[PDB]
């Protein structure tokens, strides 16, 4: 249910007035949610795609990201974080029964404009992290709507996050990665080989089951109490990175801090093939799906490592992201469907 | 003879023997570049008895080139053998980053190169046209080979940003490219709101050519206010070099100059980024800031900037950054000539001039370390073709056919748009005319002229009519509501 | 091996002029080339001074600020 | 009138951009090439045009006029030039330094003198940028370059602020930040970086000038009642146009929402218009009468 | 799909300045267009229609047609085609990455009142088709600017038009409606049948009356159409491929029937009774009726286009109000 392929033409096709910039999937319903130049977040329907179930417009410019998530309390609703470029971030609530967007409220406190957000809950705790212009990662708690942490891990202005419970992974337009631990905020290791500023950094998390997979397992049961074993990046340079995170001098229920002689990133594998600026990644089972400005989108074997497929002439003009259901996530079922937005002010799902 | 060259002594010049090294015949070049192009052609087995016509074609080329366009026209008009040897290393060049080549897309890119080393310093209108029918002369005479496309100099665009390879990629497909580059190059660097003509288009495919080359430097020339620093700081941020300005100010000397060149070199050499510095010719105040530059670019070094314990220091930085690369290098020659190898290959000096007639201009270009290192690149003024374009990208966008219009029937030579069908192409026609006349009759000679009175009288035009047709609307439709208001009010009188 | 600058095709003028520059420097005689600017001075000099196991080389590049420190700090490390 | 919009538009944007630096007969030959120009593309203009009468209206013409500025045609459209000028930097070349006088009347006390040769330029210059003070800055012919990414307004816009890279540091700026460049020498060496991107505006007195004021000075000398009459049917016109208009609106307010007594006075006041018209249909063309009278005196003169 | 049933009650209540005199989709998009009778042009979202998109006063009288086409092919844009009593044909198209209309140019030559206006595209050709008070039809040029050629279809004042191919249906203000060719500019026949004049006559596209009735009528493209009068009936006719027949004859409506448009096998017209019903063409009985939608009369009525492969067939449609209102229906 892991090696599911998407064909060679989409499902549906859903037109919208500006350049899609962020597209995510509801984990429960066949809704896709789609935000776009003028910062107007858009609630379609998978099979009546013909006109939105709800369409809002909330940011003043531009939104630059999203992320949902379903909250799992010990009621249960889905949280629409909408980042854009008028210094501010949107928190809504998607209400199943109204098909109407909720705003629960609004966080502020970012200098320049803010460029991607990301939330998790750990246990009865929902998190909102958010990185922007002026080099600040910043976390809010989401019940609270309070900053609890800022730091600056960047020289330059940071552009893509990540979180697996108390660890995060910035790219910023320095071209470096660098780890840090979350609660500590101290910077955990850095790392370099890129060229260009990075698009996207995302987690490799781990898997239960499978015939046999190199990037998704720990090698030892140290890496198996650390709980991450690798990490993707794609950049402007037209390459996808897979680094190995090394580990840095732990303590038992104390923080983290840095090794000096393993506190930098070791680049494992440099997949390369894509015509232009590498814009988002995904990982879905044993497969990661790319896309970048050449009107394509690729998908890889993280195990053989080359390009089994490609979906050139996807858009017209740039492809701007992809979002696929979470595989890793026991309370998330990963779905087959694949859903991607471009910048011809059009977005494609494909189904089955 | 020449400028910079001074005469000699007698009584030194009599212990020496003189001897003279003329230019080499057409056979000899011949046969070098047979064995240039042989060597290249070993990378594309397929074509290798293409090797004598494209060498020929090359010698005749540069003869051709050397005897039209002499000194007598302009003064920058020199030409050499290191055009021909420029001409072998840029068809290597894009042989080596290309696809799997066809013999007319050999032709074509060896145009392409041939357009932008023996025809980028041509300044007339008809010196283009004259090289393009030369161009077309010498592929029919020495590579005859039939469908084969225009090869003019904006339908040779050859370039690598669209793909992995250096191909020949689509006008519309490289316009579109360039579009949306330049819309996130303004949200991310200073927003500048330009326009994307054709010619904008071929500038900023040459200036990513000669950006990409090993010890790649610019010379671009042309009027004021053409898009020469803001396409070199585009095309810089599309490479991803590292854009530094002198900010020389009036209160400068070789201390601020001789700093801020130290800078660049360090982080050159010590940080291994690339830097792409752009010298504008009013940076260079005095003669020493130009002997500064000819310095920097005849040679890899500047060896006034380190001296004694900036010397021993720069020698300490450049052991330790060896050692962070684990080379195993100890005497001063190996780190004085890695060094200076890093920077011949992570600096590029781009020269921005806008009056040529200029004395210190005019000393910039007849500089020998300048003129034969940087690539000349005559941007000139606007012509006809490109103000057109910018005209009607600039009036698409205002309130303009509301009235009846009659076309005109005038000469074909007078008419610089496409053939009139509306009024958008009288106003961009009468523009330019105004332009021309103008310009012609302040007697500007044979300087460059700058497009910014046609620029800005467009950004003025548009705000005008925008202004007034709103004010002429509003005042219609007071009248006109007005009118039906006491129409209905004298029907309603004589109803009752 | 196109884009070294060092390399040179070698024609029969270049082996000419070669043969006198050997010639000359035997009879303990100092030399002067001169020509157009792109005529192939520096190539050919240095080209018979860098395949030749009697001549070594102590290059100095001459500029328009050139004292005699430098021609002596450059014969110094020779 | 709207059938010759677009030419008058035309010729309006012609003059502010091109004409700033020009004396008085190369504008009349300039001005003659364009309308011929639009004559030729069958582009209708309006064959009575004025540039004072089409962008300056009577207010801002007192306006200035109270300031300081010179009753000259040719001034009275140079200061139209200036202050239309809302991108480009506006650069006054005036010999005699006169209208440094009339900026900072028009502008009051938020005028700040600044100069190209003062030590504590930059600091003060940043500060009126960040203030948002209207500043004039003297001496024009020594240009600092410093200051360059103001000239070419080569901003970037922070979110909701928008910054402007000055010296070693970014600065912000104010919506109401001016800047005007002043010079004396009419022979100094303005750089071309400069000369391309501002509004280059000629405050000089020529020997076509010296034509136009001799004939100016010997009509309000020689025959003043024609001249007062003419400025007091032009003020007359302008303030029953402004009546008219006031008296039309509540007219319209009134029929929307007494009337007989309102349509009488509007129709008093178009028979007062029509009859203004007709007076001073006979009263402009002998200005001309004038004009035929006294050349010679400006010939002789120059 | 195609069979949608609209609700008995309006779920956007969008308010205008003054009586809707014309309405318009978004053929990919959920933004309406409304004309006003002071010549202002609104555009509202559907999903907040508190506050208009972007208005502008096209022209200074009130707007007598309407309509628009998204280009298909040089970037594809929406057109909109607006013609009004000041004998003025302005053209606009929207742009959706600022959200507001803008000038193209304006359509100029008519010597009285437009009457309607039809946009339809050729492979690479954009046409405009508009009639006046002055019973003659030019046929346009989008990009070019002038006439192409100059008819007369009828000896009275021709009030409708509608464009499908190289033959262009006309209804006069006489019951003599006739249709004629637009590039040989010859008419072929006239029909009658009417006692009142004729408010709305447009083809009906192949998707009782929907499929082509012999192989003369499959290979011309033309079969049969329908025409509103205001005799306060729906009559369905039947084009030659050199007179006419009648065979359906289709009533119910209180007033003057203003608009209709096909949707598949259903039809949907509006009359001047402030009522909505939707009549089948097989059975030709109203099955759906509306009451009190508005206060005043509905002018006019839009609905999406089948018989276009690169429109979608949205399940929703607008009727315009003369009660200074619009009715937007929703699922
Ligand atoms: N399409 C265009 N191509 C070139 N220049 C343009 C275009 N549109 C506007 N410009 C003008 O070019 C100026 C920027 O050019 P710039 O490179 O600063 O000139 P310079 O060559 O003097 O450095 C802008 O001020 C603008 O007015
Ligand atoms: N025999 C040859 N083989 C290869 N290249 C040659 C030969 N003769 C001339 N050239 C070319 O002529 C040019 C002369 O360059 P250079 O020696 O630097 O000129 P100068 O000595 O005047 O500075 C070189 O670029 C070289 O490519
Ligand atoms: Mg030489």
Same mark, same amino acid.
């Given at each position: 249910?892991?090696?599911?392929?998407?064909?060679?033409?989409?499902?549906?096709?859903?037109?919208?007035?500006?350049?899609?910039?962020?597209?995510?999937?509801?984990?429960?319903?066949?809704?896709?949610?789609?935000?776009?130049?003028?910062?107007?977040?858009?609630?379609?329907?998978?099979?009546?795609?013909?006109?939105?179930?709800?369409?809002?417009?909330?940011?003043?410019?531009?939104?630059?990201?999203?992320?949902?998530?379903?909250?799992?309390?010990?009621?249960?609703?889905?949280?629409?974080?909408?980042?854009?470029?008028?210094?501010?971030?949107?928190?809504?609530?998607?209400?199943?029964?109204?098909?109407?967007?909720?705003?629960?409220?609004?966080?502020?406190?970012?200098?320049?404009?803010?460029?991607?957000?990301?939330?998790?809950?750990?246990?009865?705790?929902?998190?909102?992290?958010?990185?922007?212009?002026?080099?600040?990662?910043?976390?809010?708690?989401?019940?609270?709507?309070?900053?609890?942490?800022?730091?600056?891990?960047?020289?330059?202005?940071?552009?893509?996050?990540?979180?697996?419970?108390?660890?995060?992974?910035?790219?910023?337009?320095?071209?470096?990665?660098?780890?840090?631990?979350?609660?500590?905020?101290?910077?955990?290791?850095?790392?370099?080989?890129?060229?260009?500023?990075?698009?996207?950094?995302?987690?490799?998390?781990?898997?239960?089951?499978?015939?046999?997979?190199?990037?998704?397992?720990?090698?030892?049961?140290?890496?198996?109490?650390?709980?991450?074993?690798?990490?993707?990046?794609?950049?402007?340079?037209?390459?996808?990175?897979?680094?190995?995170?090394?580990?840095?001098?732990?303590?038992?229920?104390?923080?983290?801090?840095?090794?000096?002689?393993?506190?930098?990133?070791?680049?494992?594998?440099?997949?390369?093939?894509?015509?232009?600026?590498?814009?988002?990644?995904?990982?879905?089972?044993?497969?990661?799906?790319?896309?970048?400005?050449?009107?394509?989108?690729?998908?890889?074997?993280?195990?053989?490592?080359?390009?089994?497929?490609?979906?050139?002439?996807?858009?017209?003009?740039?492809?701007?992201?992809?979002?696929?259901?979470?595989?890793?996530?026991?309370?998330?079922?990963?779905?087959?469907?694949?859903?991607?937005?471009?910048?011809?002010?059009?977005?494609?799902?494909?189904?089955? | 003879?020449?400028?910079?060259?001074?005469?000699?002594?007698?009584?030194?010049?009599?212990?020496?023997?003189?001897?003279?090294?003329?230019?080499?015949?057409?056979?000899?070049?011949?046969?070098?570049?047979?064995?240039?192009?042989?060597?290249?052609?070993?990378?594309?087995?397929?074509?290798?008895?293409?090797?004598?016509? *494209?060498?020929?074609?090359?010698?005749?080329?540069?003869? +051709?080139?050397?005897?039209?366009?002499?000194?007598?026209?302009?003064?920058?008009?020199?030409?050499?053998?290191?055009?021909?040897?420029?001409?072998?290393?840029?068809?290597?060049?894009?042989?080596?980053?290309?696809?799997?080549?066809?013999?007319?897309?050999?032709?074509?890119?060896?145009?392409?190169?041939?357009?932008?080393? *023996?025809?980028?310093?041509?300044?007339?209108?008809?010196?283009?046209?004259?090289?393009?029918?030369?161009?077309? +002369?010498?592929?029919?005479?020495?590579?005859?080979?039939?469908?084969?496309?225009?090869?003019?100099?904006?339908?040779?665009?050859?370039?690598?940003?669209?793909?992995?390879?250096?191909? +020949?990629?689509?006008?519309?497909?490289?316009?579109? *490219?360039?579009?949306?580059?330049?819309?996130?190059?303004?949200?991310?660097?200073?927003?500048?709101?330009?326009?994307?003509?054709?010619?904008?288009?071929?500038?900023?495919?040459?200036?990513?050519?000669?950006?990409? &080359?090993?010890?790649?430097?610019?010379?671009?020339?042309?009027?004021?206010?053409?898009?020469?620093?803001?396409?070199?700081?585009?095309?810089?941020?599309?490479?991803?070099?590292?854009?530094? &300005?002198?900010?020389?100010?009036?209160?400068?000397?070789?201390?601020?100059?001789?700093?801020?060149?130290?800078?660049?070199?360090?982080?050159?050499?010590?940080?291994?980024?690339?830097?792409?510095?752009?010298?504008?010719?009013?940076?260079?105040?005095?003669?020493?800031?130009?002997?500064?530059?000819?310095?920097?670019?005849?040679?890899?070094?500047?060896?006034?900037?380190?001296?004694?314990?900036?010397?021993?220091?720069?020698?300490?930085?450049?052991?330790?950054?060896?050692?962070?690369?684990?080379?195993?290098?100890?005497?001063?020659?190996?780190?004085?000539?890695?060094?200076?190898?890093?920077?011949?290959?992570?600096?590029?000096?781009?020269?921005?001039?806008?009056?040529?007639?200029?004395?210190?201009?005019?000393?910039?270009?007849?500089?020998?370390?300048?003129?034969?290192?940087?690539?000349?690149?005559?941007?000139?003024?606007?012509?006809?073709?490109?103000?057109?374009?910018?005209?009607?990208?600039?009036?698409?966008?205002?309130?303009?056919?509301?009235?009846? *219009?009659?076309?005109?029937?005038?000469?074909?030579?007078?008419?610089?748009?496409?053939?009139?069908?509306?009024?958008?192409?009288?106003?961009?026609?009468?523009?330019?005319?105004?332009?021309?006349?103008?310009?012609?009759?302040?007697?500007?000679?044979?300087?460059?002229?700058?497009?910014?009175?046609?620029?800005?009288?467009?950004?003025?035009?548009?705000?005008?009519?925008?202004?007034?047709? &709103?004010?002429?609307?509003?005042?219609?439709?007071?009248?006109?509501?007005?009118?039906?208001?006491?129409?209905?009010?004298?029907?309603?009188?004589?109803?009752? | 091996?196109?884009?070294?600058?060092?390399?040179? /095709?070698?024609?029969?003028?270049?082996?000419?002029?070669?043969? /006198?520059?050997?010639?000359?420097?035997?009879?303990?005689?100092?030399?002067?080339?001169?020509?157009?600017?792109?005529?192939?001075?520096?190539?050919?000099?240095?080209?018979?001074?860098?395949?030749?196991?009697?001549?070594?080389?102590?290059? /100095?590049?001459?500029?328009?600020?050139?004292?005699?420190?430098? /021609?002596?700090?450059?014969?110094?490390?020779? | 009138?709207?059938?010759?919009?677009?030419?008058?538009?035309?010729?309006?944007?012609?003059?502010?951009?091109?004409?700033?630096?020009?004396?008085?007969? %190369? #504008?009349?030959?300039?001005?003659?090439?364009?309308?011929?120009?639009?004559?030729?593309?069958?582009?209708?203009?309006?064959?009575?045009? #004025?540039?004072?009468?089409?962008?300056?209206?009577?207010?801002?013409?007192?306006?200035?006029?109270?300031?300081?500025?010179?009753?000259?045609?040719?001034?009275?459209?140079?200061?139209?030039?200036?202050?239309?000028?809302?991108?480009?930097?506006?650069?006054?070349?005036?010999?005699?330094?006169?209208?440094?006088?009339?900026?900072?009347?028009?502008?009051?006390?938020?005028?700040?003198?600044?100069?190209?040769?003062?030590?504590?330029?930059?600091?003060?210059?940043?500060?009126?940028?960040?203030?948002?003070?209207?500043?004039?800055?003297?001496?024009?012919?020594?240009?600092?370059?410093?200051?360059?990414?103001?000239?070419?307004?080569?901003?970037?816009?922070?979110?909701?602020?928008?910054?402007?890279?000055?010296?070693?540091?970014?600065?912000?700026?104010?919506?109401?930040?001016?800047?005007?460049?002043?010079?004396?020498?009419?022979?100094?060496?303005?750089?071309?970086?400069?000369?391309?991107?501002?509004?280059?505006?000629?405050?000089?007195?020529?020997?076509?000038?010296?034509?136009?004021?001799?004939?100016?000075?010997?009509?309000? %000398? %020689?025959?003043?009642?024609?001249?007062?009459?003419?400025?007091? =049917?032009?003020?007359?016109?302008?303030?029953?146009?402004?009546?008219?208009?006031? =008296?039309?609106?509540? =007219?319209?307010? %009134?029929?929307?929402?007494?009337?007989?007594?309102?349509?009488?006075?509007?129709?008093?006041?178009?028979?007062?218009?029509?009859?203004?018209?007709?007076?001073?249909?006979?009263?402009?063309?002998?200005?001309?009468?004038?004009?035929?009278?006294?050349?010679?005196?400006?010939?002789?003169?120059?």
């Amino acid at each position: 249910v892991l090696k599911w392929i998407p064909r060679n033409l989409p499902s549906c096709l859903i037109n919208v007035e500006s350049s899609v910039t962020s597209v995510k999937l509801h984990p429960n319903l066949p809704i896709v949610f789609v935000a776009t130049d003028h910062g107007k977040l858009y609630a379609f329907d998978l099979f009546n795609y013909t006109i939105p179930l709800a369409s809002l417009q909330s940011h003043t410019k531009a939104i630059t990201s999203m992320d949902v998530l379903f909250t799992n309390y010990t009621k249960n609703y889905l949280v629409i974080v909408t980042a854009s470029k008028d210094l501010q971030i949107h928190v809504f609530k998607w209400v199943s029964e109204e098909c109407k967007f909720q705003q629960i409220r609004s966080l502020l406190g970012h200098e320049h404009i803010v460029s991607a957000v990301k939330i998790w809950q750990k246990n009865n705790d929902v998190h909102i992290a958010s990185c922007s212009r002026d080099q600040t990662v910043k976390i809010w708690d989401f019940h609270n709507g309070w900053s609890l942490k800022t730091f600056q891990p960047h020289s330059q202005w940071v552009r893509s996050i990540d979180v697996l419970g108390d660890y995060i992974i910035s790219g910023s337009h320095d071209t470096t990665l660098r780890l840090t631990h979350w609660p500590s905020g101290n910077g955990l290791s850095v790392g370099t080989g890129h060229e260009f500023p990075i698009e996207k950094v995302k987690f490799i998390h781990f898997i239960e089951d499978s015939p046999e997979i190199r990037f998704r397992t720990p090698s030892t049961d140290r890496y198996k109490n650390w709980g991450m074993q690798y990490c993707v990046s794609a950049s402007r340079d037209r390459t996808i990175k897979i680094w190995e995170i090394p580990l840095p001098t732990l303590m038992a229920h104390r923080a983290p801090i840095p090794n000096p002689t393993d506190s930098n990133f070791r680049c494992v594998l440099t997949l390369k093939g894509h015509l232009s600026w590498v814009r988002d990644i995904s990982i879905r089972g044993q497969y990661l799906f790319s896309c970048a400005d050449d009107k394509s989108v690729r998908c890889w074997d993280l195990n053989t490592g080359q390009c089994l497929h490609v979906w050139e002439k996807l858009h017209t003009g740039f492809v701007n992201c992809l979002d696929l259901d979470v595989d890793f996530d026991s309370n998330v079922t990963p779905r087959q469907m694949m859903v991607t937005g471009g910048l011809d002010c059009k977005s494609n799902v494909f189904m089955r | 003879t020449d400028p910079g060259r001074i005469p000699m002594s007698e009584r030194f010049t009599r212990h020496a023997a003189i001897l003279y090294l003329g230019y080499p015949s057409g056979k000899s070049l011949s046969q070098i570049y047979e064995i240039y192009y042989k060597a290249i052609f070993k990378l594309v087995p397929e074509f290798r008895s293409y090797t004598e016509p *494209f060498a020929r074609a090359s010698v005749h080329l540069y003869n +051709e080139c050397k005897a039209r366009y002499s000194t007598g026209l302009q003064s920058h008009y020199l030409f050499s053998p290191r055009e021909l040897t420029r001409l072998v290393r840029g068809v290597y060049t894009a042989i080596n980053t290309g696809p799997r080549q066809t013999l007319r897309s050999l032709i074509r890119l060896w145009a392409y190169e041939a357009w932008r080393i *023996f025809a980028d310093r041509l300044v007339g209108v008809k010196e283009k046209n004259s090289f393009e029918q030369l161009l077309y +002369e010498t592929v029919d005479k020495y590579l005859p080979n039939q469908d084969l496309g225009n090869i003019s100099s904006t339908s040779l665009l050859f370039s690598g940003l669209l793909s992995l390879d250096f191909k +020949e990629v689509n006008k519309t497909d490289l316009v579109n *490219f360039i579009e949306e580059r330049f819309k996130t190059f303004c949200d991310e660097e200073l927003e500048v709101p330009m326009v994307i003509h054709e010619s904008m288009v071929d500038h900023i495919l040459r200036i990513d050519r000669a950006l990409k &080359q090993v010890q790649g430097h610019m010379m671009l020339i042309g009027a004021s206010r053409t898009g020469k620093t803001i396409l070199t700081r585009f095309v810089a941020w599309l490479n991803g070099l590292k854009i530094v &300005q002198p900010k020389i100010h009036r209160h400068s000397n070789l201390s601020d100059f001789d700093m801020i060149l130290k800078k660049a070199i360090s982080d050159c050499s010590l940080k291994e980024s690339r830097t792409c510095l752009i010298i504008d010719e009013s940076n260079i105040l005095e003669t020493a800031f130009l002997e500064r530059m000819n310095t920097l670019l005849a040679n890899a070094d500047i060896p006034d900037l380190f001296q004694g314990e900036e010397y021993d220091k720069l020698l300490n930085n450049l052991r330790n950054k060896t050692r962070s690369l684990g080379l195993l290098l100890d005497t001063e020659q190996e780190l004085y000539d890695w060094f200076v190898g890093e920077i011949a290959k992570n600096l590029h000096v781009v020269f921005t001039i806008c009056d040529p007639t200029n004395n210190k201009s005019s000393a910039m270009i007849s500089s020998p370390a300048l003129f034969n290192r940087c690539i000349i690149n005559w941007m000139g003024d606007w012509d006809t073709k490109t103000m057109s374009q910018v005209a009607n990208n600039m009036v698409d966008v205002v309130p303009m056919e509301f009235t009846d *219009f009659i076309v005109p029937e005038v000469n074909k030579e007078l008419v610089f748009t496409e053939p009139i069908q509306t009024i958008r192409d009288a106003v961009v026609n009468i523009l330019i005319h105004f332009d021309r006349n103008f310009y012609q009759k302040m007697k500007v000679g044979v300087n460059p002229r700058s497009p910014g009175y046609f620029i800005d009288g467009l950004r003025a035009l548009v705000k005008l009519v925008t202004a007034k047709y &709103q004010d002429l609307q509003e005042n219609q439709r007071f009248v006109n509501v007005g009118l039906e208001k006491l129409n209905e009010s004298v029907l309603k009188v004589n109803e009752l | 091996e196109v884009m070294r600058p060092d390399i040179v /095709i070698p024609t029969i003028d270049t082996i000419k002029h070669e043969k /006198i520059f050997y010639d000359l420097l035997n009879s303990k005689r100092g030399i002067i080339l001169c020509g157009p600017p792109g005529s192939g001075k520096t190539m050919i000099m240095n080209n018979a001074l860098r395949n030749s196991s009697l001549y070594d080389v102590v290059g /100095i590049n001459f500029s328009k600020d050139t004292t005699t420190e430098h /021609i002596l700090s450059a014969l110094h490390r020779h | 009138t709207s059938q010759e919009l677009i030419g008058n538009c035309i010729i309006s944007s012609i003059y502010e951009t091109y004409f700033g630096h020009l004396n008085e007969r %190369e #504008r009349g030959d300039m001005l003659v090439i364009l309308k011929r120009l639009l004559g030729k593309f069958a582009v209708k203009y309006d064959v009575n045009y #004025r540039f004072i009468d089409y962008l300056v209206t009577l207010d801002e013409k007192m306006k200035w006029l109270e300031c300081g500025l010179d009753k000259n045609d040719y001034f009275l459209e140079n200061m139209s030039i200036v202050m239309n000028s809302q991108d480009a930097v506006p650069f006054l070349l005036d010999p005699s330094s006169h209208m440094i006088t009339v900026i900072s009347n028009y502008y009051g006390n938020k005028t700040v003198l600044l100069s190209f040769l003062e030590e504590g330029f930059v600091k003060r210059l940043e500060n009126a940028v960040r203030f948002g003070s209207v500043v004039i800055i003297q001496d024009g012919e020594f240009f600092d370059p410093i200051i360059s990414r103001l000239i070419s307004r080569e901003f970037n816009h922070a979110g909701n602020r928008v910054t402007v890279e000055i010296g070693d540091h970014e600065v912000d700026v104010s919506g109401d930040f001016k800047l005007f460049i002043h010079s004396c020498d009419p022979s100094g060496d303005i750089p071309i970086f400069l000369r391309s991107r501002v509004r280059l505006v000629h405050f000089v007195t020529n020997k076509e000038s010296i034509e136009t004021r001799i004939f100016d000075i010997t009509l309000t %000398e %020689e025959n003043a009642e024609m001249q007062r009459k003419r400025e007091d =049917l032009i003020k007359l016109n302008t303030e029953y146009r402004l009546k008219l208009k006031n =008296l039309e609106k509540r =007219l319209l307010e %009134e029929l929307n929402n007494e009337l007989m007594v309102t349509l009488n006075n509007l129709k008093k006041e178009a028979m007062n218009i029509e009859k203004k018209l007709s007076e001073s249909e006979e009263f402009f063309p002998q200005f001309d009468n004038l004009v035929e009278e006294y050349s010679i005196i400006g010939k002789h003169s120059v």
